[PDB]
Design a protein around this ligand. Sequence first.
Ligand SMILES: [Cl-]
Ligand SMILES: [Cl-]
Lengths: 142, 139
Amino acid sequence: SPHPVLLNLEQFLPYRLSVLSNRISGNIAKVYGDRYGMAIPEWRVITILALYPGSSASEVSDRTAMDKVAVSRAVARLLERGFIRRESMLALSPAGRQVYETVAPLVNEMEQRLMSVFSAEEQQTLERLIDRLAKDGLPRMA
Amino acid sequence: HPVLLNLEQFLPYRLSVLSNRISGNIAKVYGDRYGMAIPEWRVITILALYPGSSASEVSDRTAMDKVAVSRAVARLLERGFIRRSMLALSPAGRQVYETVAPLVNEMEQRLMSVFSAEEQQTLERLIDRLAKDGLPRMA
Ligand SMILES: [Cl-]
Ligand SMILES: [Cl-]
């Protein structure tokens, strides 16, 4: 029987965005992955706690829209490693902050290279279109 | 303790969050209809378009973590949505796709309705550029 294609993925925005994001995150992980035996979600928790000390795992999942189970798993692993600490409320430990301060600079550098293929105007345009999708596009989906 | 990564204005983060929110809203369609998880749906859509694909082939195409795809395939096999190294949708899996895809399409159209034909084109053009020239510039 014929198998009708109903979603042409390669030209489907949600797919295109998820794939690109996966590749970007994968590239950034080359900076800390093997060096610290750290997973992508674990690094994300670290960056979040640096900006928002005292956040709960629930809030981390909320703001990033990440799977709650994945977030809880990352938090559990970071706690076992002593990179974050509780008071519930979570925060970076001095050991986690040392990792953060060592990795962050390198990640910023890589992001700079990524965006260097865009002119100032193009960069502004992208951020503008992204903001529009987030603010006015998302609520129209339900 | 200085903030070295200003996430709120960090493109990789902004893109990741938006993508996750778009996927989460789409996930309600099949989450409600079949109690299915995001990775599972993605696998279904890939196998629907490319029958015979292996777990490894799915991962390379989507850039998803190999372990997440493997576990998704395990769940789908257990539930009878796909069947056997070459994977293919079962009649049940085909029905999930045919039922869900149209609704996902309509939801995506509502999402993109905020743009005009030209704005949508522009967005696709910048995303393309980021993927073609931006990625190799990173590493
Ligand atoms: Cl989808
Ligand atoms: Cl990051």
